[PDB]
Each structure stands twice: as structure tokens, then as C-alpha cells.
Amino acid sequence: YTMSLGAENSVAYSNNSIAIPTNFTISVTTEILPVSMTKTSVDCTMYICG
Amino acid sequence: FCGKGYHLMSFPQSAPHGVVFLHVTYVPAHEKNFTTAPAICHDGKAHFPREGVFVSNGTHWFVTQRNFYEPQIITTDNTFVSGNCDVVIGIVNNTVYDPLQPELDS
Amino acid sequence: DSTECSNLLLQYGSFCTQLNRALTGIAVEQDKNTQEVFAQVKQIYKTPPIKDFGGFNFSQILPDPSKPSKRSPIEDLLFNKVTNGLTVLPPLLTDEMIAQYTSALLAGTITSGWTFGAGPALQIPFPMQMAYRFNGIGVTQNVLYENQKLIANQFNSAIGKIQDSLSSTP
Numbered sequence: 001y002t003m004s005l006g007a008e009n010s011v012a013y014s015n016n017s018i019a020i021p022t023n024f025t026i027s028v029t030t031e032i033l034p035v036s037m038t039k040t041s042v043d044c045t046m047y048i049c050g
Numbered sequence: 051f052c053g054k055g056y057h058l059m060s061f062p063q064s065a066p067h068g069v070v071f072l073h074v075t076y077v078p079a080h081e082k083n084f085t086t087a088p089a090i091c092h093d094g095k096a097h098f099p100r101e102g103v104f105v106s107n108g109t110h111w112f113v114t115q116r117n118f119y120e121p122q123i124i125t126t127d128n129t130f131v132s133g134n135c136d137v138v139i140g141i142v143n144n145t146v147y148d149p150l151q152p153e154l155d156s
Numbered sequence: 157d158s159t160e161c162s163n164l165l166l167q168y169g170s171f172c173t174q175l176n177r178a179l180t181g182i183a184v185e186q187d188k189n190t191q192e193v194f195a196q197v198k199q200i201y202k203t204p205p206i207k208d209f210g211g212f213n214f215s216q217i218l219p220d221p222s223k224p225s226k227r228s229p230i231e232d233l234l235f236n237k238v239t240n241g242l243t244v245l246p247p248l249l250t251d252e253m254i255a256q257y258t259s260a261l262l263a264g265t266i267t268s269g270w271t272f273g274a275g276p277a278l279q280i281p282f283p284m285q286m287a288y289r290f291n292g293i294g295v296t297q298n299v300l301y302e303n304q305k306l307i308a309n310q311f312n313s314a315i316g317k318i319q320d321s322l323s324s325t326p
């Protein structure tokens with residue numbers, strides 16, 4: 001199928017109306033970031049010729 | 051940069067070859083409609099909120115903080131006066147309470 | 157199509173697999189880059205039918221209904237101004253969907269301010285949103301409200317100058 005980018009939401013914009021939050025949610029989210037790799041060393045002479 | 055929502059704080063956690071950030075954020079919820087105006091016209095003067103926004107629940111005007119609904123009476127302590135009512139587009143008429151008024155009234 | 161050449165090429169091992177895997181990684185990386193840049197909202201926002209924004213004109217940046225591609229005049233100008241074993245993979249997101257994502261971002265930032273980026277989209281009038289932005293840079297709200305017509309005229313003039321500058325510079 002052709003993908004849907006997102007659910008449709010039409011914001012009710014008018015020149016004299018505002019929306020004010022009356023409550024809140026404390027949301028905890030995870031972010032995973034790689035920092036380092038495995039430190040590898042190769043003996044060039046041993047690898048090519050043994 | 052530090053999570054989805056208004057960022058409050060973050061926690062680091064060690065991971066194999068990496069770090070995991072637990073982002074604690076504040077998300078607004080349960081929003082409600084209100085009728086708003088840029089300024090309040092009182093005594094031929096325009097009043098603007100010092101830190102909040104003017105909202106109306108239908109009949110009465112209040113000033114509240116932008117990110118949470120906490121209606122408070124429109125007074126001279128939370129508004130500032132700049133100019134008359136003839137320049138601002140969309141100004142509405144409402145009273146502005148004065149805290150000093152009962153003190154000299156009594 | 158030479159069988160002898162392929163037979164000799166097999167002596168060199170998995171070089172071809174490494175090259176194909178690297179190119180595949182680059183190809184998925186491009187789609188990931190587009191996804192990270194443009195797909196930052198999960199709600200497709202639209203502007204109201206009446207373009208009453210307190211004097212502010214966004215015609216040059218909002219999508220044009222007359223055009224089949226549903227692009228803005230600026231976006232249309234930008235698209236006009238850009239001109240053996242090989243295959244070209246198509247991008248995962250088409251130009252129409254990227255334009256739709258930009259349209260959603262524009263509708264969110266015009267009708268809802270910065271609220272949609274941090275949670276639910278909360279409607280606010282545009283001359284109040286601009287006043288909030290003015291307060292962000294340390295200028296009082298009254299300055300924005302009193303000089304709303306001048307700021308709207310300057311903004312429209314600057315947007316027109318941007319379109320003219322893009323159209324007139326190779």
C-alpha cells in the first residue's frame with residue numbers, strides 16, 4: 001500500500017480562541033547512543049604471512 | 051534534544067559500548083478551549099499580561115500562566131499598562147481590580 | 157556476461173559482497189536521513205480555510221491548491237531550479253510526501269506555535285504567538301501589538317524578497 005504519513009488532525013484555528021492545558025503527564029523516554037567500539041589490533045606481518 | 055516534550059531532567063545509564071539516557075519531560079494534557087484577547091481595556095488604558103495570557107470561560111476574564119490552566123483575577127500586579135485602547139487590534143473591555151482600593155476604601 | 161571472468165573473479169573471495177553491503181548501507185542511510193529530517197510529526201496538520209492571521213500572509217510558503225503537486229510557490233521554484241550494473245533505487249519518501257510533511261510542519265507552527273512539537277497541538281492566534289516569540293527575545297508584548305500592521309507588512313515584504321532573490325540568483 002501507499003504509506004500514510006500520519007493521522008489527520010485539523011487544528012481549530014480562530015483569531016480569538018486559545019487552548020490552555022489543564023493537566024500534565026510526566027513522560028520518560030529512552031535514547032540509546034553508541035559511545036565506543038571493540039578495540040582491535042591486527043599484526044600485519046602475521047596476518048599476511050604467518 | 052533531550053526527549054520529546056518540555057525537558058525537565060535526564061538520567062544516564064551505562065550500556066555495553068554505549069549510554070542510555072532516560073529523559074524525564076513534561077507533556078501538557080487535557081487542554082481546554084478559552085476565548086482570548088491581546089489586551090484588556092480599562093479606564094482608557096491598555097493592560098497586557100506580565101507573564102501570562104488573558105482567557106475567558108464565557109462570561110468572566112482571567113489571566114493564567116501559558117503552560118497550565120490556573121485562572122487568577124486580573125489585577126494591576128500581574129498586568130502592565132502601555133498606551134491607550136485605540137491602537138491594539140482586538141482589545142476587549144473588562145475591569146481591572148486594584149489591591150490598594152479596599153485599603154483606602156476602609 | 158563473461159563466465160570465465162566471473163570464474164576468475166570468484167578467486168578473490170567476498171569483495172563483491174562487501175561492496176554491495178556498503179552501498180546498501182548508504183542507500184538505507186539516505187532514507188534514514190530523510191526520515192529524521194522531515195518526519196518529526198505524527199499528526200498531519202492543516203491550515204484553516206480562512207487565512208485570517210492578523211495581517212500575516214503565508215501564501216508563498218503554504219501549498220498551492222492550483223498546482224497538482226500540492227507544493228508552495230517557493231517549493232515549486234526550488235524544484236524548478238534544481239536540474240553496466242548500475243541501478244538507481246527510488247527514495248522511500250516521494251517529493252509529494254516530503255512536501256506534505258513540510259505542509260504539516262508549517263500548519264503546526266502557524267496555528268499551534270511550538271506546542272505541537274512538545275505535545276498536543278494547542279491553538280493560539282498568530283498575533284499572540286508572535287507576541288510570545290517577542291517575549292522570548294526580550295521584547296515586551298505591547299511593542300508587537302501596537303506595531304502589528306508594520307510587522308506584518310515587513311514580514312510579507314521579506315517573504316517576497318526571498319522569493320525574488322531565489323528566482324533571480326542562479
Ligand SMILES: *[C@@H]1O[C@H](CO)[C@@H](O[C@@H]2O[C@H](CO)[C@@H](O)[C@H](O)[C@H]2NC(C)=O)[C@H](O)[C@H]1NC(C)=O
Pocket residue numbers: 010011012019081082083
Ligand atoms: C475547541 O473548539 C473547537 C471548535 O468548537 C473544537 O474543534 C472541533 O473538534 C471536533 C472534535 O474533534 C471536530 O469534530 C470538529 O470538526 C472541530 N471543529 C473544527 C472547526 O475544527 C476543538 O476540539 C475544541 N477543543 C477542545 C480541547 O475540545
Ligand SMILES: *[C@@H]1O[C@H](CO)[C@@H](O[C@@H]2O[C@H](CO)[C@@H](O)[C@H](O)[C@H]2NC(C)=O)[C@H](O)[C@H]1NC(C)=O
Pocket residue numbers: 022023024080
Ligand atoms: C490529571 O491527570 C491525572 C492522571 O495522571 C489524574 O489522576 C487520576 O485521577 C483519577 C480520578 O481522580 C484516578 O482514578 C487516577 O488513579 C489518577 N491517576 C493518578 C496517576 O493519580 C488527575 O485527577 C487529573 N487532574 C485533573 C484536574 O484533571
Ligand SMILES: *[C@@H]1O[C@H](CO)[C@@H](O[C@@H]2O[C@H](CO)[C@@H](O)[C@H](O)[C@H]2NC(C)=O)[C@H](O)[C@H]1NC(C)=O
Pocket residue numbers: 107108109110
Ligand atoms: C467563569 O468562571 C467564574 C469564576 O468561577 C464563574 O463565576 C462563578 O459562577 C459560580 C456559579 O454560578 C458562582 O457560584 C460564583 O460565585 C461565581 N464567581 C464569581 C467570582 O462570579 C463563571 O460562572 C464562569 N462562567 C461560566 C460560563 O462557566
Ligand SMILES: *[C@@H]1O[C@H](CO)[C@@H](O[C@@H]2O[C@H](CO)[C@@H](O)[C@H](O)[C@H]2NC(C)=O)[C@H](O)[C@H]1NC(C)=O
Pocket residue numbers: 091143
Ligand atoms: C469599550 O469601551 C469603550 C469606551 O467606553 C467604548 O468606546 C465607546 O463606544 C461608543 C459607541 O461605539 C462611543 O459612543 C464612545 O464615544 C466610545 N468611547 C470612546 C472613549 O471611544 C467601546 O465601544 C467599548 N467596546 C465594547 C465592545 O463594548
Ligand SMILES: *[C@@H]1O[C@H](CO)[C@@H](O[C@@H]2O[C@H](CO)[C@@H](O)[C@H](O)[C@H]2NC(C)=O)[C@H](O)[C@H]1NC(C)=O
Pocket residue numbers: 207213214215216
Ligand atoms: C497574500 O499574498 C498573495 C501573494 O503575495 C496575494 O496574492 C496577490 O493578490 C493580488 C491582488 O489580487 C494579485 O494582483 C496578485 O497577482 C496576487 N499574487 C499571487 C502570487 O497570487 C494575496 O492577495 C495576499 N493576501 C491574502 C489575503 O491572501
Ligand SMILES: *[C@@H]1O[C@H](CO)[C@@H](O)[C@H](O)[C@H]1NC(C)=O
Pocket residue numbers: 015016139140141
Ligand atoms: C476575529 O474576526 C472576526 C470576523 O470573523 C472579527 O469580527 C473580530 O473582531 C476578530 N477578532 C479579533 C480579536 O481579531
